[PDB]
């Protein structure tokens, strides 16, 4: 296959629409890995997505330690 990235042209890798942690950095936010029996090039995932409940009169207090 052929793929056009801002770092050039990539031949031999198939582009997928998922996102994983980077294994081999190619550049411009594009990384590559060996998975599935094949080589897949993907876009980096910064991390999990979270939201915090904020209001005038709410607090969170821990009840245990490690």
């Amino acid at each position: 296959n052929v793929f056009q990235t801002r770092a050039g042209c990539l031949i031999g890798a198939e582009y997928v629409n998922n996102s994983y942690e980077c294994d081999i950095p190619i550049g411009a936010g594009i990384c590559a890995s060996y998975q599935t029996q094949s080589i897949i090039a993907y876009t980096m995932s910064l991390g999990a997505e979270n939201s915090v409940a904020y209001s005038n009169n709410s607090i969170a207090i821990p009840t245990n330690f490690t």
């Binding site: 770092a7 991390g47 915090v52």
Partner: protein, 411 residues
């Protein structure tokens, strides 16, 4: 309440050099002759690759410090503080803020210089992280510090109202919470005015980003001198080698070629050494920036003149071309007044020392007050402790102490 700006460089520009094109151009005879000098280019490639990976390591260490990406809730009330200029703006396609846009715009037929340098074997590689990812990291850090506080730097993010967070920080610097709870509106107005002044200064002044511009200028000057070195004879007949080959016989052409090769190799060596030194300095700056990010943004620092000039309250990060910008919010006293003091109070033949504050007098009476704010109170046994008689301490004075129990005995 004061807001101060700090600028720190983080990374550099990644470069790659092609030996054969730079030295021998498009001549095959020089290409054949070059092999005699051994392995002089594998070392150069290794050094440049090391610098290139070092830059990405620097950026990743500085910015990637949060495991989860947070978002601010749609409601934008934070106790009167605006924050609308430093939070992401969804309208623009870059998902950036006003100050970030100003900072990026601040630092900047015919053929472009980049193409001309590329056509001689000097190329620039792209960084691993785009600007959007750095913006997302900055937004996540801002959301975490606004909503959770410093709890997200040591575990899970626990929500807390902004006013109570400010009260905790005031307690940290050494002032009680009632000051904030009674001057919330004034503090919010001061913060908004300071942010507006920062806006005006950024929009007007164009010389506050010197360090990143100096980095860019140094890189440009190094490339310029490397390119200019190609047009010097080094003691030969001419710089152009085809004329040397055509004009005169091989016996002296070999000497001329050797002179040119030695000169160009020496120039490349000098360039690599200067690049190594500059990269070391940039890495030191990046380490300092990472430490500052971990100490001033994810917590409160007691160190003096580290996270701002004054008493530190908190800080905010923003991105910049090849660098980071810190907005420090700090506390400074004003409108001071003179008073008369004593070290202890001798009452009932016993010495009395304050528990937290200091003793003051306004001319006739005596009070106890906190250190960083004028708030007098009557000297009682609840805010005083006794140790020994009053004939040893130098400078003790006479007064009376109030006991909150005897009034209740008779009433």
């Amino acid at each position: 309440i004061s807001v101060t700006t700090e600028i720190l460089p983080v990374s550099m520009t990644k470069t790659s050099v092609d030996c054969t094109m730079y030295i021998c151009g498009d001549s095959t005879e020089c290409s054949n002759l070059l092999l005699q000098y051994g392995s002089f280019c594998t070392q150069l490639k290794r050094a440049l690759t090391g610098i290139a990976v070092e830059q990405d390591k620097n950026t990743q260490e500085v910015f990637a410090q949060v495991k989860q990406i947070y978002k601010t809730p749609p409601i934008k009330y934070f106790g009167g503080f605006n924050f609308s200029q430093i939070l992401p703006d969804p309208s623009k396609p870059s998902k950036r803020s006003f100050i970030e846009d100003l900072l990026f715009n601040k630092v900047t037929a015919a053929r472009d210089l980049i193409c001309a340098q590329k056509f001689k074997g000097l190329t620039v590689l792209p960084p691993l992280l785009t600007d959007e990812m750095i913006a997302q990291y900055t937004s996540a850090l801002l959301a975490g510090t606004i909503t959770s506080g410093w709890t997200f730097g040591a575990g899970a993010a626990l929500q807390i109202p902004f006013a109570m967070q400010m009260a905790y920080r005031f307690n940290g610097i050494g002032v009680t919470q009632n000051v904030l709870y009674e001057n919330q509106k004034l503090i919010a107005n001061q913060f908004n005015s300071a942010i507006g002044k920062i806006q005006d200064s950024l929009s007007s002044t164009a010389s506050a980003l010197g360090k990143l511009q100096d980095v860019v200028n140094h890189n440009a000057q190094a490339l310029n001198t490397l390119v200019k070195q190609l047009s010097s004879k080094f003691g030969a007949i001419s710089s152009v080698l085809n004329d040397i080959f055509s004009r005169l016989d091989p016996p002296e052409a070999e000497v001329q070629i050797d002179r040119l090769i030695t000169g160009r190799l020496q120039s490349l060596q000098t360039y690599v050494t200067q690049q190594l030194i500059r990269a070391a300095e940039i890495r030191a700056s990046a380490n300092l920036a990472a430490t500052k990010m971990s100490e001033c943004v994810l917590g409160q620092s007691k160190r003096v003149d580290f996270c701002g000039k004054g008493y530190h309250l908190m800080s905010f990060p923003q991105s910049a071309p090849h660098g980071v910008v810190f907005l420090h919010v700090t506390y400074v006293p004003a409108q001071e007044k003179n008073f008369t003091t004593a070290p202890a109070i001798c009452h009932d033949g016993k010495a009395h020392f304050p528990r937290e504050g200091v003793f003051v007098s306004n001319g006739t009476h005596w009070f106890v007050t906190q250190r960083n704010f004028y708030e007098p109170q009557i000297i009682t046994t609840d805010n005083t402790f006794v140790s020994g008689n009053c004939d040893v301490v130098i400078g003790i004075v006479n007064n009376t102490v109030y006991d909150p129990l005897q009034p209740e005995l008779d009433s």
